[PDB]
Design a protein around this ligand. Structure first.
Ligand SMILES: *[C@@H]1O[C@H](CO)[C@@H](O[C@@H]2O[C@H](CO)[C@@H](O[C@@H]3O[C@H](CO[C@H]4O[C@H](CO)[C@@H](O)[C@H](O)[C@@H]4O)[C@@H](O)[C@H](O[C@H]4O[C@H](CO)[C@@H](O)[C@H](O)[C@@H]4O)[C@@H]3O)[C@H](O)[C@H]2NC(C)=O)[C@H](O)[C@H]1NC(C)=O
Ligand SMILES: *[C@@H]1O[C@H](CO)[C@@H](O[C@@H]2O[C@H](CO)[C@@H](O[C@@H]3O[C@H](CO[C@H]4O[C@H](CO)[C@@H](O)[C@H](O)[C@@H]4O)[C@@H](O)[C@H](O[C@H]4O[C@H](CO)[C@@H](O)[C@H](O)[C@@H]4O)[C@@H]3O)[C@H](O)[C@H]2NC(C)=O)[C@H](O)[C@H]1NC(C)=O
Ligand SMILES: *[C@@H]1O[C@H](CO)[C@@H](O[C@@H]2O[C@H](CO)[C@@H](O[C@@H]3O[C@H](CO[C@H]4O[C@H](CO)[C@@H](O)[C@H](O)[C@@H]4O)[C@@H](O)[C@H](O[C@H]4O[C@H](CO)[C@@H](O)[C@H](O)[C@@H]4O)[C@@H]3O)[C@H](O)[C@H]2NC(C)=O)[C@H](O)[C@H]1NC(C)=O
Ligand SMILES: *[C@@H]1O[C@H](CO)[C@@H](O[C@@H]2O[C@H](CO)[C@@H](O[C@@H]3O[C@H](CO[C@H]4O[C@H](CO)[C@@H](O)[C@H](O)[C@@H]4O)[C@@H](O)[C@H](O[C@H]4O[C@H](CO)[C@@H](O)[C@H](O)[C@@H]4O)[C@@H]3O)[C@H](O)[C@H]2NC(C)=O)[C@H](O)[C@H]1NC(C)=O
Ligand SMILES: *[C@@H]1O[C@H](CO)[C@@H](O[C@@H]2O[C@H](CO)[C@@H](O[C@@H]3O[C@H](CO[C@H]4O[C@H](CO)[C@@H](O)[C@H](O)[C@@H]4O)[C@@H](O)[C@H](O[C@H]4O[C@H](CO)[C@@H](O)[C@H](O)[C@@H]4O)[C@@H]3O)[C@H](O)[C@H]2NC(C)=O)[C@H](O)[C@H]1NC(C)=O
Ligand SMILES: *[C@@H]1O[C@H](CO)[C@@H](O[C@@H]2O[C@H](CO)[C@@H](O[C@@H]3O[C@H](CO[C@H]4O[C@H](CO)[C@@H](O)[C@H](O)[C@@H]4O)[C@@H](O)[C@H](O[C@H]4O[C@H](CO)[C@@H](O)[C@H](O)[C@@H]4O)[C@@H]3O)[C@H](O)[C@H]2NC(C)=O)[C@H](O)[C@H]1NC(C)=O
Lengths: 542, 542
């Protein structure tokens, strides 16, 4: 008589476990005779899953349990078990068996990809986003056992795992510490996905973390650039030089941030050739301080500028001197006078021309264009590198004649633009000059004769508008009352003036009554160029 | 009749546990009547430790167990327990109770100090030693339960704990990752000491990690230094300038590594004053490229140099021009000649003096020291800023007389060292000169008269050792056979020479037979200074 000890059993059965595990012991006993009580289940669907020993009574697995193999309309599963005998002893017992399936991990978690990629900064702050690692569930949801959980392992790769820690719930790969490493290094970050239920099933993946590409800090060929000097006659398009910087496998974009407030130079963005954008002159500034910046391709692509000190260079562009302006004269009419007895190599006048803005020159070559002169003679010539006009030939018996010539001035020994001025040379004798007798030694007269010439010019130009005083000769005191020699320590200063209104001789009686008419002012205005000495004694006709 | 179920019990008893825990149930039963079996221990030393209920039989603690409270001569502890009754039923039972004490943590671990200090590098590599954290055991040793174990906790300080990990067995605090942080930041690293036994007892400590002190990279006041120019007359001790660099709270030690291979300059190590170590001249180099290094105090103390690019500056020291050398003359004897009829402002000679190494000058002032001259007259004077000697007075009826004067030369209009040379001036008339008749126009003679003077000097110095040819005057062709005028397009070149051996006149017949004796070579050597023209026709006495 097989009877059951208890009619209802309730056992929570773990699913997806490997076969061979025994869970429950169901026991029935024969009252009359026998310990060979046999067990049979009235459920064909769990015969594949469970295997029940018909002699001991242990319930073991033949195939691993699947909750989806059961109908989904039952949150509690109940079947029936009968018990028989070999001979067939009666009464037969009827009991109920309730199998409770625990809801946990069914399939191991599967990653979406095998290999992931990312990028980090060499100075990445705490919490920098890199990439997203996500795996599928392969699990009927609705419980915290269907939620993936991420962590790092340092038993095989301690260097990536101690630096980059994956967030627990979101799976975001952030920076746990501030890293300080070398670029172009590929790490192996093994991330193990696991759930939070019974026997944990897990897999492995690989996260390939490359840092960046170098070429971040540009290296100039020269810290301070000095091009060769460019001419002041340069126009738009003149290449004054080129700047160059080197970086590891990156393109360099150049730009000018300061130094061209007058908008004089420009640079190409992809090459670095600095060319003239507006013509430079000597009236403007002659030296510039240009600030050239060099940037990598990665910071231009990410709208940044390189945060270094060695990204700034200085360019000094100096302007050289060329031919730009024609020479100008001090006066357009240079007036001098020569005597009839004046041999060759005699000093006449000093023609001086200056450039208005050009200072390259050291000496200027002068040329003369001559009108024809009588008796087959030839006119004046001038020294080349000096400009000092000399007397060419003797001019005997020529009264009030004037020899007008033109001086051609061109800088740097002659190449380019030209200028022209007029030179008036008069011929004089004793019938047109006068002798001023002074009480001064001859040493005070000679070393400052041009200043005394200018002061006598200021004297003579007050009485008649327009005069040029030319000192012909200086001598000792020999022009007295009876033309005798009295004192060897005094002087006869022969002073002559030329009227530019007629380009001819001024009468000697006119200059006589001019210089004798203002004597009390002439004796006072002759003061500052003394040195020492006395008064002006008299003025005598030669 | 109280009898025991079993005579010997063996229970491993946990030590140092809080009181109230029950471990063993000892059971005795009365055969006749009673369930109130009472228990008494025969050990006075465990009465403080253990408390035994005389009605139920549970063994609970009254005081926590100490292994040192027991005698140390027993590795196994055994006492005796009797059992009585209220009425005193017989036979009494005798049993043995063996108490086994488990050997684990007795006292919690105690640190040696509360606060520890350390220092780290801003670029510290993996495994950099910092400090030593060590705690006492407070435990009788001889088991792995008396070994301390260190780990970090990131629940309250995630930033220090994720960066610095303490070694497990040695307690050495190393760098787990490469840190990249800011200086002067004090961290709080809580290290919890724990053993590897039963109920873990633990305490807490604090590790104060300061990084370093800044001032590592020096900042120059100028990247490129240019002192004002120093004189060439400077000696040892002249301060040409000073260099300065700034750092955060650190001292700067200066040194020169390149630029002074001739050992010209030196610098003070604690201030930066650059002074002259050897006198600089213009014969040496005029511009230097000095490389000045600035180092922090921490790298000098640790025998290092700062690993930057902005630790190098360039110093350009330029030398200005001062008075160093006296002026030298081209020749110590300048020889010229004047006529008897030579008025004032007449060109005589050009005295030229140059400095041997000084190039500051633009014009040189000359002075004359005169011997006394007859008739109350006064001697020669010279122009100040030119050096051109002019004729002072007329020299009538003076035959073969020479007027020797001395020229004083001092650069920069006169301040300092002086020089002296001799000047010989002779007086000539028509009785000592000669006339050379040539077939050349006058335009070819005047512009190159000094070169023709040098060629005539080379002519005359071949016949007599020592002569100086001075061209007195140039004229048109008027010295013929009968002293008549024939051609106005030809020249009379009056050529005169002075003998320095007597400082007097050379005879005109001597120069006549000199220049007439070598005529076929003179007509060929006169070639390169033509321009154009013909031959030399004749030589006629004036
Ligand atoms: C800027 O750009 C330049 C040029 O573009 C880069 O230079 C190249 O760098 C790559 C990467 O390192 C080189 O590619 C590899 O070269 C190896 C040759 O090894 C040499 O050097 C080692 C160490 O000194 C010697 O022992 C050896 O004998 C060689 O002399 C190859 O063996 C590699 O092939 C292997 O790897 C690849 C990729 O994994 C596989 O597909 C192959 O099948 C093989 O397994 C590889 O080709 C390249 O040679 C470099 N070029 C030059 C001209 O030097 C710079 O690196 C870059 N700058 C930075 C900072 O990255
Ligand atoms: C180095 O890099 C710099 C900066 O990147 C360059 O400067 C840029 O140059 C481009 C090319 O000219 C500019 O792009 C164009 O800008 C025009 C703006 O016109 C201004 O200037 C004119 C003349 O002074 C004024 O009359 C006018 O009012 C504006 O003030 C736009 O109108 C252009 O758009 C037209 O052309 C494009 C292309 O054909 C069409 O698609 C459009 O629909 C439209 O018809 C054009 O965008 C740019 O603006 C400049 N940037 C700056 C900041 O100024 C340098 O040129 C470069 N160096 C070299 C040598 O190339
Ligand atoms: C800006 O400034 C620079 C430098 O100051 C000027 O260059 C000078 O130009 C002048 C004029 O040409 C030079 O002066 C002359 O130099 C001659 C040297 O000749 C050289 O070149 C020729 C042709 O290549 C060669 O055949 C020869 O062998 C030489 O290598 C001298 O021989 C000249 O002297 C002669 O002429 C003068 C005047 O007529 C006479 O008085 C002399 O006795 C002699 O017969 C003359 O000195 C000068 O040398 C140049 N300087 C330099 C440093 O080269 C630029 O010209 C100026 N810019 C402009 C636009 O003009
Ligand atoms: C190079 O050397 C200079 C000078 O030696 C240093 O400058 C000093 O730095 C220290 C440390 O920071 C300063 O000391 C502290 O100053 C506090 C004043 O706080 C001011 O600033 C805050 C923030 O702007 C304002 O809110 C506030 O109102 C003040 O204006 C004091 O409050 C501090 O006292 C507290 O801390 C100490 C130490 O823990 C305790 O003992 C006190 O009881 C109190 O709790 C402290 O004194 C100092 O003031 C700075 N001096 C100057 C002149 O500025 C540089 O820091 C150094 N360079 C580097 C890189 O470190
Ligand atoms: C900036 O910093 C530099 C480097 O630190 C300094 O150079 C050092 O200067 C000190 C001070 O003179 C030197 O110390 C002494 O060196 C002597 C070596 O003598 C040499 O030179 C002499 C003269 O040319 C030779 O005759 C001789 O043979 C050697 O070649 C030692 O003899 C000294 O020791 C004696 O003096 C000390 C102190 O009194 C005693 O304790 C000793 O027992 C012994 O009697 C002394 O050590 C040092 O050597 C220099 N360093 C280098 C690398 O040369 C600069 O001086 C400093 N700038 C300034 C302005 O101070
Ligand atoms: C290295 O080179 C420098 C620059 O080339 C020299 O400095 C020059 O020195 C000379 C000589 O003294 C100067 O030439 C003269 O300058 C006078 C200007 O006087 C100034 O100074 C005085 C005193 O402080 C003031 O009272 C006055 O108001 C002025 O401020 C001119 O007046 C001079 O001209 C007079 O003398 C000459 C010669 O006799 C006459 O021909 C004139 O007609 C006039 O009467 C004279 O020009 C020159 O100016 C200085 N240059 C500069 C830029 O200052 C250094 O001297 C030299 N080194 C050495 C060691 O000598």
């Amino acid at each position: 008589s097989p009877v059951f000890t208890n009619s209802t059993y309730t056992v929570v059965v773990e699913e997806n476990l490997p076969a061979g595990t025994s869970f429950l012991q169901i026991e029935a006993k024969d009252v009359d005779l026998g310990a060979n009580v046999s067990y049979r289940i009235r459920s064909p669907e769990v015969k594949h899953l469970f295997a029940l020993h018909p002699f001991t009574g242990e319930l073991s697995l033949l195939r691993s349990l699947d909750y989806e193999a059961f109908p989904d309309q039952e949150a509690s599963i109940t079947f029936l078990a009968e018990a028989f005998d070999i001979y067939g002893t009666m009464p037969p017992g009827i009991a109920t068996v309730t199998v409770i399936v625990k809801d946990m991990n069914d399939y191991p978690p599967v990653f979406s990809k095998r290999i992931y990629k990312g990028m980090v900064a060499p100075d990445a702050v705490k919490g920098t986003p890199i990439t997203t690692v996500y795996a599928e569930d392969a699990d009927p949801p609705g419980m915290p056992a269907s939620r993936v959980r991420y962590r790092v392992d340092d038993v095989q790769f301690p260097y990536p795992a101690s630096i980059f820690d994956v967030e627990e719930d979101s799976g975001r790969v952030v920076t746990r510490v501030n890293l300080n490493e070398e670029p172009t290094t590929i790490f192996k970050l093994v991330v193990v996905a696991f759930d939070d239920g019974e026997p944990v099933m897990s897999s492995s993946a690989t996260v390939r973390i490359l840092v960046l590409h170098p070429g971040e800090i540009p290296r100039f060929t020269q810290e301070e650039y000095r091009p060769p000097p460019v001419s002041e006659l340069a126009a738009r398009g003149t290449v004054v030089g080129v700047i160059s910087a080197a970086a590891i496998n990156q393109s360099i974009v150049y730009s000018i941030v300061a130094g061209n407030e007058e908008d004089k130079f420009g640079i190409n963005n992809v090459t670095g050739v600095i060319y003239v954008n507006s013509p430079l002159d000597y009236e403007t500034r002659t030296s510039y301080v240009l600030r050239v910046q060099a940037d990598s391709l990665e910071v231009v692509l990410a709208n940044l500028r390189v945060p270094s000190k060695s990204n700034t260079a200085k360019v000094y562009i100096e302007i050289q001197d060329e031919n730009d302006h024609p020479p100008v004269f001090q006066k357009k009419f240079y007036i001098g006078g020569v005597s009839e007895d004046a041999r060759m190599f005699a000093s006449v006048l000093r023609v001086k021309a200056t450039d208005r803005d050009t200072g390259n020159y050291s000496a200027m070559a002068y040329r003369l264009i001559i009108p024809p002169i009588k008796e087959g003679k030839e006119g004046f010539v001038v020294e080349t590198y000096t400009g000092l006009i000399k007397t060419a030939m003797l001019f005997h018996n020529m009264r009030r004649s004037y020899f007008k010539f033109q001086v051609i001035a061109t800088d740097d020994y002659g190449k380019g633009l030209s200028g022209k001025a007029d030179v008036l040379v008069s011929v004089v004798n004793q019938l047109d000059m006068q002798v001023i007798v002074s009480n001064v030694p001859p040493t005070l007269v000679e070393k400052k004769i041009e200043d005394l010439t200018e002061i006598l010019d200021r004297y003579v130009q007050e009485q008649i508008p327009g005069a040029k005083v030319v000192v012909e000769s200086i001598g000792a005191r020999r022009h007295g009352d009876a033309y005798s020699l009295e004192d060897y320590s005094k002087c006869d200063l022969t002073v002559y003036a030329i009227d530019p209104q007629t380009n001819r001789a001024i009468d000697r009686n006119e200059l006589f009554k001019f210089l004798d008419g203002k004597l009390l002012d002439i004796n006072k205005d002759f003061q500052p160029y003394y040195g020492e000495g006395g008064r002006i004694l008299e003025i005598r006709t030669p």
